[PDB]
């Protein structure tokens, strides 16, 4: 029932790929966000995507080497040691009010 992120992996190597796997999303959400760091906060908004345009929303703290799935799941590529930390994604609800899950992979 609840909103998980699954780092795959936790442990990764520079230059390497991370998946943040996403379950238990609503059904029917209007979109996503990632960021960086614990909370939802505009500066460090990575990347977005809203559902009934399939657009992808790069925020402040994207990087090419990220892409963002249509199940708001996040694929990483060629991390580095500055990746390590914590990753936060917002759903917004069909209903507009939003929900927060916060994972973290580390970078060696
Ligand atoms: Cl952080
Ligand atoms: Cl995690």
């Not at 059904?27 to 992808?56: F, H, L």
Request: aromatic content about 8%; glycine content about 6%.
């Amino acid at each position: 029932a609840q909103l998980t992120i699954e780092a795959v992996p936790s442990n990764a190597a520079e230059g390497k790929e991370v998946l943040l796997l996403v379950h238990n999303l609503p059904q029917d959400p209007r979109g996503y966000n990632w960021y960086k760091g614990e909370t939802v906060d505009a500066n460090r908004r990575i990347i977005g995507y809203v559902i009934s345009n399939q657009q992808i929303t790069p925020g402040p703290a994207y990087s090419n080497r990220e892409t963002i799935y249509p199940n708001a799941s996040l694929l990483m590529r060629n991390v580095t040691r500055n990746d390590t930390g914590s990753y936060t994604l917002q759903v917004i609800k069909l209903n507009l009010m939003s929900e927060e899950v916060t994972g973290q992979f580390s970078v060696h």
